[PDB]
């Protein structure tokens, strides 16, 4: 056996035992049946970083959304965005921010 072969990872438990795949090659995506030992912790940390990216792009999207027409009723973006205009319904009547007809024609 070569000197450097002791430094290499074994074939994982996902890989069939009769499959040969030249363990010295560094694949940028992981390679043949990649199964690292601390994978659950790494999965949790990458999920946390993805959540950070999710918050960042949610904030950027909310800051840069432009609505040239008022909506025709209540939309869920009213809850988190203050640039959403007041709804104007299908008959042209101005509405409240919770999507109900104002007093004078309600009930």
């Amino acid at each position: 056996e070569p000197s450097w072969a002791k430094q290499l990872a074994p074939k994982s438990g996902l890989c069939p035992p009769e499959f040969h795949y030249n363990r010295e090659i560094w694949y940028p995506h992981g390679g043949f049946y990649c199964d690292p030992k601390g994978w659950r912790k790494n999965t949790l940390l990458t999920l946390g970083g993805i959540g950070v990216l999710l918050y960042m792009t949610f904030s950027y999207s909310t800051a840069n959304e432009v609505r040239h027409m008022p909506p025709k009723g209540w939309i869920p973006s009213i809850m988190w965005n203050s640039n959403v205009p007041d709804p104007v319904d299908f008959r042209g009547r101005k509405l409240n921010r919770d999507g109900t007809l104002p007093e004078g024609e309600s009930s």
Binding site: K72, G73, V88, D89, F90, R91, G92
Partner: protein, 85 residues
């Protein structure tokens, strides 16, 4: 189309702009279209039962226009001699 003239429009331009009626739906049944769109887009899953009247009235108006279109075609072909009178 003089023998079967069009009915008056009951929806103004401002009313069709307020309902955002598509420009190829702005015909002589546009008010019924406005009622049907307003009912259906706010009724969710159960639109077929609680907007049945608005859809039925819109289709009835389109039936009247369909009959007028058939009558216009019959009169035009009669004037051209294609159908004997």
């Amino acid at each position: 189309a003089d023998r079967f003239p069009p009915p008056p429009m009951k929806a103004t331009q401002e009313q069709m702009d307020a309902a955002d009626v598509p420009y190829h739906y702005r015909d002589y049944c546009a008010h019924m279209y406005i009622d049907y769109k307003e009912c259906r887009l706010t009724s969710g899953f159960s639109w077929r039962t609680k907007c049945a009247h608005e859809l039925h009235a819109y289709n009835k108006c389109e039936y009247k226009e369909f009959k007028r279109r058939v009558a216009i075609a019959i009169e035009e072909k009669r004037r051209r001699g294609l159908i004997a009178a």
